[PDB]
CSV table of C-alpha atoms and ligand atoms in Angstrom, one decimal:
chain,number,residue,atom,x,y,z
A,1,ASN,CA,-37.7,-34.9,82.4
A,2,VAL,CA,-40.2,-37.8,83.9
A,3,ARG,CA,-42.5,-35.6,81.8
A,4,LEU,CA,-39.7,-36.3,78.5
A,5,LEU,CA,-39.7,-39.8,79.8
A,6,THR,CA,-43.6,-40.0,79.8
A,7,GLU,CA,-43.7,-38.3,76.4
A,8,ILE,CA,-41.3,-40.9,74.2
A,9,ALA,CA,-43.0,-43.8,76.1
A,10,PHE,CA,-46.5,-42.5,75.2
A,11,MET,CA,-45.6,-41.6,71.9
A,12,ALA,CA,-44.1,-45.3,71.1
A,13,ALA,CA,-47.3,-47.0,72.4
A,14,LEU,CA,-49.1,-44.8,70.0
A,15,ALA,CA,-47.1,-45.7,67.2
A,16,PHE,CA,-47.9,-49.3,68.2
A,17,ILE,CA,-51.3,-48.8,68.4
A,18,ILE,CA,-51.7,-47.1,65.1
A,19,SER,CA,-49.5,-49.8,63.8
A,20,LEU,CA,-51.8,-52.5,64.2
A,21,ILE,CA,-54.6,-50.7,62.2
A,22,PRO,CA,-54.4,-52.6,58.2
A,23,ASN,CA,-52.2,-50.1,55.9
A,24,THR,CA,-51.5,-52.3,52.7
A,25,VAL,CA,-52.0,-51.0,49.5
A,26,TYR,CA,-51.1,-53.6,47.5
A,27,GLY,CA,-48.5,-56.9,48.6
A,28,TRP,CA,-46.0,-55.6,50.7
A,29,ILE,CA,-46.6,-51.8,49.3
A,30,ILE,CA,-47.8,-49.8,52.8
A,31,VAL,CA,-48.5,-46.6,54.1
A,32,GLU,CA,-47.1,-46.4,57.4
A,33,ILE,CA,-48.9,-44.0,59.2
A,34,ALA,CA,-47.4,-45.2,62.9
A,35,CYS,CA,-44.4,-43.3,61.5
A,36,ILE,CA,-46.3,-40.3,62.7
A,37,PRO,CA,-46.1,-40.4,66.3
A,38,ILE,CA,-42.5,-41.2,65.8
A,39,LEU,CA,-41.7,-38.8,64.0
A,40,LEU,CA,-43.9,-35.6,65.9
A,41,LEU,CA,-41.4,-36.9,69.1
A,42,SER,CA,-38.8,-36.5,67.1
A,43,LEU,CA,-39.4,-32.8,65.8
A,44,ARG,CA,-40.7,-32.5,69.6
A,45,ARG,CA,-37.9,-33.4,71.6
A,46,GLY,CA,-35.0,-33.8,69.3
A,47,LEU,CA,-32.8,-36.6,68.2
A,48,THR,CA,-31.9,-38.7,71.2
A,49,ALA,CA,-35.6,-38.6,72.5
A,50,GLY,CA,-36.8,-39.7,68.7
A,51,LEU,CA,-34.0,-42.6,68.7
A,52,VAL,CA,-35.8,-43.9,71.7
A,53,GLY,CA,-39.3,-43.8,70.7
A,54,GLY,CA,-38.2,-45.6,67.3
A,55,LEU,CA,-36.3,-48.4,69.4
A,56,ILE,CA,-39.6,-48.7,71.6
A,57,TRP,CA,-41.8,-48.8,69.1
A,58,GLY,CA,-39.8,-51.9,67.2
A,59,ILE,CA,-39.4,-53.6,70.6
A,60,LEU,CA,-42.8,-53.7,71.0
A,61,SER,CA,-43.6,-54.7,67.4
A,62,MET,CA,-41.7,-57.9,67.5
A,63,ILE,CA,-42.4,-59.0,71.4
A,64,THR,CA,-45.9,-58.9,70.3
A,65,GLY,CA,-45.9,-61.0,67.5
A,66,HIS,CA,-46.7,-57.8,64.6
A,67,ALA,CA,-43.1,-57.7,63.0
A,68,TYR,CA,-42.9,-60.0,59.8
A,69,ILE,CA,-39.6,-61.8,61.3
A,70,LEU,CA,-37.3,-63.8,58.6
A,71,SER,CA,-33.8,-63.4,60.5
A,72,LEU,CA,-32.0,-61.9,63.9
A,73,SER,CA,-30.2,-59.4,61.1
A,74,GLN,CA,-33.3,-59.0,59.3
A,75,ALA,CA,-35.6,-57.8,62.6
A,76,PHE,CA,-32.6,-56.1,63.6
A,77,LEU,CA,-32.5,-54.1,60.4
A,78,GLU,CA,-36.4,-53.9,60.0
A,79,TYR,CA,-37.5,-53.6,63.8
A,80,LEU,CA,-34.7,-51.9,65.3
A,81,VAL,CA,-32.7,-49.5,63.0
A,82,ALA,CA,-35.2,-48.8,60.8
A,83,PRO,CA,-37.7,-47.5,63.0
A,84,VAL,CA,-34.8,-45.7,65.1
A,85,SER,CA,-34.2,-44.2,62.3
A,86,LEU,CA,-37.2,-41.9,62.0
A,87,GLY,CA,-35.3,-39.9,65.2
A,88,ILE,CA,-33.4,-38.1,62.5
A,89,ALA,CA,-36.3,-36.1,62.5
A,90,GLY,CA,-35.1,-34.9,65.5
A,91,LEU,CA,-32.0,-33.0,63.5
A,92,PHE,CA,-35.0,-30.6,62.6
A,93,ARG,CA,-36.2,-29.9,66.4
A,94,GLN,CA,-37.7,-26.0,66.6
A,95,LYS,CA,-37.2,-25.1,69.6
A,96,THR,CA,-38.0,-21.6,69.1
A,97,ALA,CA,-41.2,-19.1,68.0
A,98,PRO,CA,-43.0,-19.1,65.4
A,99,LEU,CA,-43.0,-22.8,64.1
A,100,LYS,CA,-42.2,-23.0,60.4
A,101,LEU,CA,-43.4,-25.9,58.7
A,102,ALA,CA,-40.3,-25.9,56.4
A,103,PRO,CA,-38.1,-28.1,58.7
A,104,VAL,CA,-41.4,-30.3,60.0
A,105,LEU,CA,-41.5,-31.2,56.3
A,106,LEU,CA,-37.8,-31.4,55.7
A,107,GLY,CA,-37.4,-33.5,58.4
A,108,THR,CA,-39.8,-35.5,57.8
A,109,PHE,CA,-38.8,-36.2,54.5
A,110,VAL,CA,-35.6,-37.0,55.4
A,111,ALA,CA,-37.0,-39.5,58.3
A,112,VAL,CA,-39.1,-41.4,55.9
A,113,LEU,CA,-36.9,-41.4,53.5
A,114,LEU,CA,-34.0,-43.0,56.1
A,115,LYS,CA,-36.2,-45.4,57.3
A,116,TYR,CA,-37.5,-47.1,53.9
A,117,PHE,CA,-33.8,-46.9,52.4
A,118,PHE,CA,-33.1,-49.3,55.0
A,119,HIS,CA,-36.4,-51.3,54.2
A,120,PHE,CA,-35.0,-50.9,50.6
A,121,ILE,CA,-32.2,-52.6,51.6
A,122,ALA,CA,-33.7,-55.6,53.3
A,123,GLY,CA,-35.9,-56.0,50.7
A,124,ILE,CA,-33.0,-57.0,48.4
A,125,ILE,CA,-31.4,-59.3,51.2
A,126,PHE,CA,-34.2,-60.7,52.5
A,127,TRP,CA,-37.2,-60.6,50.4
A,128,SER,CA,-36.6,-61.1,46.5
A,129,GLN,CA,-38.0,-64.6,46.7
A,130,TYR,CA,-41.0,-62.4,46.4
A,131,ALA,CA,-40.2,-60.1,44.1
A,132,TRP,CA,-42.9,-59.5,41.1
A,133,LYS,CA,-42.5,-62.4,38.1
A,134,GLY,CA,-39.7,-60.6,35.7
A,135,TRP,CA,-38.3,-58.3,38.1
A,136,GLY,CA,-34.7,-58.4,39.7
A,137,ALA,CA,-33.9,-58.1,43.4
A,138,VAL,CA,-33.5,-54.5,43.5
A,139,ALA,CA,-36.0,-53.2,41.2
A,140,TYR,CA,-38.6,-54.8,43.1
A,141,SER,CA,-37.2,-53.8,46.6
A,142,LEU,CA,-37.2,-50.3,45.1
A,143,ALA,CA,-40.5,-50.1,44.4
A,144,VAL,CA,-42.3,-51.7,47.1
A,145,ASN,CA,-39.9,-49.5,49.2
A,146,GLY,CA,-40.3,-46.3,47.3
A,147,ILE,CA,-43.4,-46.1,46.7
A,148,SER,CA,-44.6,-47.4,50.6
A,149,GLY,CA,-42.1,-44.4,51.4
A,150,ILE,CA,-43.6,-41.9,49.3
A,151,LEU,CA,-46.9,-42.9,50.5
A,152,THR,CA,-46.1,-43.0,53.7
A,153,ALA,CA,-44.6,-39.3,53.5
A,154,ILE,CA,-47.9,-38.1,51.4
A,155,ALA,CA,-49.7,-39.4,54.4
A,156,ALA,CA,-47.2,-38.0,57.5
A,157,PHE,CA,-47.3,-34.5,55.3
A,158,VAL,CA,-50.8,-34.2,55.2
A,159,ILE,CA,-51.3,-35.1,58.9
A,160,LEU,CA,-48.3,-33.0,60.0
A,161,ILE,CA,-49.2,-30.2,57.9
A,162,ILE,CA,-52.9,-30.5,59.6
A,163,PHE,CA,-51.2,-30.3,63.1
A,164,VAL,CA,-49.0,-27.7,62.1
A,165,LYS,CA,-51.6,-25.4,61.1
A,166,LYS,CA,-54.1,-25.9,64.3
A,167,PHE,CA,-51.6,-27.2,67.3
A,168,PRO,CA,-48.5,-25.7,66.3
A,169,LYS,CA,-47.2,-26.2,69.7
A,170,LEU,CA,-47.1,-29.8,69.6
A,171,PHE,CA,-44.3,-29.0,67.9
A,172,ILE,CA,-42.3,-26.6,70.2
A,173,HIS,CA,-41.5,-28.1,73.9
A,174,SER,CA,-41.9,-25.6,76.7
A,175,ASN,CA,-41.4,-25.9,80.3
A,176,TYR,CA,-44.4,-24.3,82.1
B,1,BNG,C1,-35.4,-50.3,78.2
B,1,BNG,C2,-36.2,-51.5,77.7
B,1,BNG,C3,-37.5,-50.9,78.6
B,1,BNG,C4,-38.2,-52.5,78.1
B,1,BNG,C5,-39.6,-52.7,78.7
B,1,BNG,C6,-40.3,-52.5,76.3
B,1,BNG,C7,-41.3,-51.4,77.2
B,1,BNG,C8,-41.1,-50.0,78.3
B,1,BNG,C9,-41.9,-49.0,78.5
B,1,BNG,O1,-43.8,-50.2,78.3
B,1,BNG,C10,-44.7,-49.8,78.6
B,1,BNG,O2,-45.1,-49.6,77.2
B,1,BNG,C11,-46.4,-49.4,77.2
B,1,BNG,C12,-47.1,-50.1,75.8
B,1,BNG,O3,-48.2,-49.8,75.6
B,1,BNG,C13,-47.0,-47.9,77.7
B,1,BNG,O4,-48.1,-48.4,77.9
B,1,BNG,C14,-46.5,-48.1,78.9
B,1,BNG,O5,-46.6,-45.9,79.0
B,1,BNG,C15,-44.7,-48.2,79.2
B,1,BNG,O6,-44.3,-48.1,80.5
B,2,BNG,C1,-30.6,-39.4,55.1
B,2,BNG,C2,-29.4,-38.7,56.2
B,2,BNG,C3,-29.9,-37.4,56.6
B,2,BNG,C4,-29.0,-36.4,57.3
B,2,BNG,C5,-29.5,-35.3,57.7
B,2,BNG,C6,-28.8,-33.9,58.0
B,2,BNG,C7,-29.6,-33.0,59.1
B,2,BNG,C8,-29.1,-31.4,58.9
B,2,BNG,C9,-30.3,-30.8,59.7
B,2,BNG,O1,-29.8,-29.4,59.6
B,2,BNG,C10,-30.6,-28.5,60.8
B,2,BNG,O2,-31.8,-27.9,59.8
B,2,BNG,C11,-32.5,-27.1,60.4
B,2,BNG,C12,-34.1,-26.8,60.3
B,2,BNG,O3,-33.6,-26.7,58.4
B,2,BNG,C13,-31.7,-25.9,60.5
B,2,BNG,O4,-32.4,-24.6,61.2
B,2,BNG,C14,-30.4,-25.9,61.5
B,2,BNG,O5,-29.6,-24.7,60.9
B,2,BNG,C15,-29.5,-27.3,60.8
B,2,BNG,O6,-28.7,-27.6,61.9
B,3,26G,C1,-39.7,-55.9,49.3
B,3,26G,C2,-40.0,-56.2,50.7
B,3,26G,N1,-41.1,-56.7,51.1
B,3,26G,C3,-41.3,-56.7,52.7
B,3,26G,C4,-40.5,-55.6,53.2
B,3,26G,C5,-40.7,-55.8,54.7
B,3,26G,C6,-41.0,-54.3,55.1
B,3,26G,C7,-41.4,-53.3,54.1
B,3,26G,C8,-41.6,-52.0,54.4
B,3,26G,C9,-42.0,-51.9,55.9
B,3,26G,C10,-41.3,-52.8,57.0
B,3,26G,C11,-41.7,-52.9,58.5
B,3,26G,C12,-43.4,-52.1,59.3
B,3,26G,O1,-44.4,-52.9,58.8
B,3,26G,C13,-41.0,-54.0,56.7
B,3,26G,C14,-39.0,-55.2,52.7
B,3,26G,N2,-38.4,-54.6,53.8
B,3,26G,N3,-39.1,-55.4,51.9
């Protein structure tokens, strides 16, 4: 209630704080560990809570000057649509015990995939001026964003697996 709103705000604040950590692997290839609090929020509280947490994270990135903004339409795609889209993991919420790892991992996979699909589309339209010598716009965006998405999923997998084994109730909301 009040509690749902606090959880959302705190996880979005957490994602933003985490996003301040340097995460560059090479060029524009990143490991986006900042997705994890939004993933966890979504898995615990469902689609709407996740969408809104993603929204708040994106707005925070932009208004603090930490987003890479090339245009209104690009920033809309990459810092509203993209982070919001992590909320899709919410469709994999488990409401009842025992907690299973399967929906956690499938939901993480589908949500990181969806986010980076939007970054991949953005990459084609707005970032092709950076494409490695000899690479076309699509192939360059596929490699940058394909690799970033996989790496981000790897990291999300590692952390959430630990969280499932050690703190499975992070994932299951209860009153009481
Ligand atoms: C519906 C649009 C709302 C417009 C205002 C944008 C930010 C909304 C919440 O702001 C704050 O973000 C801080 C980040 O650290 C948190 O510490 C704090 O808990 C939270 O309250
Ligand atoms: C790129 C967009 C991806 C679309 C995502 C489709 C989400 C469908 C989620 O299904 C749910 O999965 C749960 C756990 O696996 C099942 O317990 C439950 O029966 C089922 O309702
Ligand atoms: C080729 C290419 N280069 C840069 C970007 C911009 C970008 C990529 C992934 C994630 C973010 C947001 C969090 O930082 C931004 C892009 N989409 N495609």
